[PDB]
């Protein structure tokens, strides 16, 4: 029964305007998690770029996005820094 994390890592290319997934949580919002104000994978898009690659599941921690650090940063920061990435997204997150 207790918690794990496993550390995984997934190329992502946008085949149209998304990375097909959408974020929840950060620094000073409604935490997806109760006391854990990291940033979580909450919806990956059917037939969208996350959800072809394959690799990331909904729940995912984001630990980082083309090596920006995910982890102390606000939902907006966030939201921030997914619009200035380009079509290539190289996702780490910590699975739980």
């Given at each position: 029964g207790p918690l794990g994390s496993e550390v995984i890592q997934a190329l992502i290319f946008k085949d149209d305007g998304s990375l097909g997934l959408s974020i929840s949580g950060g620094v000073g919002s409604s935490s997806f998690k109760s006391g854990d104000d990291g940033i979580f994978v909450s919806k990956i898009a059917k037939g969208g770029p996350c959800d072809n690659e394959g690799t990331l599941k909904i729940g995912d921690k984001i630990l980082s996005v083309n090596e920006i650090?995910?982890?102390?940063?606000?939902h907006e920061k966030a939201v921030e820094i997914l619009k200035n990435q380009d079509s290539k997204y190289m996702v780490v997150v910590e699975r739980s």
């Open positions: 650090s995910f982890t102390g940063i606000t």
